Amino acid sequence: RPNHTIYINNLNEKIKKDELKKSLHAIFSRFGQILDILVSRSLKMRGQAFVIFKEVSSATNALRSMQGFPFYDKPMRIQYAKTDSDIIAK
RNA sequence: GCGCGCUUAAUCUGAAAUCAGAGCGGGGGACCCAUUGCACAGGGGUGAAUCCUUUAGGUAGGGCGAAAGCCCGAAUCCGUCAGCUAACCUCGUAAGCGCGC
Numbered sequence: 001r002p003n004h005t006i007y008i009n010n011l012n013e014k015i016k017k018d019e020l021k022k023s024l025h026a027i028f029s030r031f032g033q034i035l036d037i038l039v040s041r042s043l044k045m046r047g048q049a050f051v052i053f054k055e056v057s058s059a060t061n062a063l064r065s066m067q068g069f070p071f072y073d074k075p076m077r078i079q080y081a082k083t084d085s086d087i088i089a090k
Numbered sequence: 091g092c093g094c095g096c097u098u099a100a101u102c103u104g105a106a107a108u109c110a111g112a113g114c115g116g117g118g119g120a121c122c123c124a125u126u127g128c129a130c131a132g133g134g135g136u137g138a139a140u141c142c143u144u145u146a147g148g149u150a151g152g153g154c155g156a157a158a159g160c161c162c163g164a165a166u167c168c169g170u171c172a173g174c175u176a177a178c179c180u181c182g183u184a185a186g187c188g189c190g191c
């Protein structure tokens with residue numbers, strides 16, 4: 001179900017948070033203004049990221065356009081976040 | 091208090107003691123392997139002490155014992171955090187009882 005925030009998984013877990021967040025911003029900022037990027041390397045949350053766009057249209061185009069993209073030698077897997085981000089609800 | 095036996099990683103050596111060694115342990119922590127995970131109590135550690143039913147029984151598991159059998163099946167701590175893991179870093183060495191003089 002379409003959301004302001006997109007959920008990406010199947011990401012290379014060896015890549016550190018700063019570099020990962022930097023690369024994600026680099027790649028997704030062209031689709032529109034990005035509100036934020038949440039990345040965690042914990043055991044449960046590693047290999048995943050949440051990209052929160054200012055506009056939902058950006059999220060949709062980004063998902064449709066970047067689906068399966070070779071990123072750090074692994075094809076990105078992109079779906080929509082199950083729940084709205086704190087930033088949008090507020 | 092002391093003698094030797096018990097659980098335990100809980101012992102031994104410095105006149106006594108975490109203040110220090112040795113011994114014996116716990117945790118953190120790469121390559122490789124494993125993990126596909128919906129974020130903003132949870133997760134995890136030591137330990138045999140985990141689990142289902144109406145305060146209780148049973149139970150995975152565990153202790154003593156030559157085997158019969160008798161028991162235990164607690165407590166607690168890190169604080170949103172930890173897989174395996176070599177190097178390297180860090181900590182613990184409390185306590186409760188059974189026999190006899």
Ligand SMILES: Nc1ncnc2c1ncn2[C@@H]1O[C@@H]2COP(=O)(O)O[C@H]3[C@@H](O)[C@H](n4cnc5c(N)ncnc54)O[C@@H]3COP(=O)(O)O[C@H]2[C@H]1O
Nearest residue numbers: 095096097138152153154155160161162163186187188189
């Ligand atoms: N690690 C463990 N895992 C699971 N259960 C455990 C356990 N450690 C102990 N238990 C159980 O709980 C009781 C605790 O006894 P405790 O050691 O306080 O007191 C014990 C012990 O201090 C002493 N004792 C037992 N066996 C001994 C022996 N062979 N020699 C000298 N003393 C002994 O007499 C008491 C008799 O205890 P008993 O064996 O009937 O009962 C024990 C035991 O059955």
Ligand SMILES: Nc1ncnc2c1ncn2[C@@H]1O[C@@H]2COP(=O)(O)O[C@H]3[C@@H](O)[C@H](n4cnc5c(N)ncnc54)O[C@@H]3COP(=O)(O)O[C@H]2[C@H]1O
Nearest residue numbers: 099115116117118134135136166167168171172180181182
């Ligand atoms: N991987 C992990 N994930 C999440 N939390 C973790 C963890 N590892 C340890 N912890 C937590 O932090 C404390 C670790 O203390 P420490 O580093 O001194 O590591 C140990 C050790 O110094 C000592 N210890 C415990 N069991 C031991 C054993 N069997 N042998 C030797 N030392 C032991 O006491 C501490 C453990 O008990 P404490 O009550 O201090 O509680 C633990 C526990 O609550």
Ligand SMILES: [Mg+2]
Nearest residue numbers: 116117135136
């Ligand atoms: Mg262990």
Ligand SMILES: [Mg+2]
Nearest residue numbers: 149150151152
């Ligand atoms: Mg049994």
Ligand SMILES: [Mg+2]
Nearest residue numbers: 096097153154
């Ligand atoms: Mg024994």
Ligand SMILES: [Mg+2]
Nearest residue numbers: 118119172173
């Ligand atoms: Mg570890």
Ligand SMILES: [Mg+2]
Nearest residue numbers: 042043172173
């Ligand atoms: Mg790790």
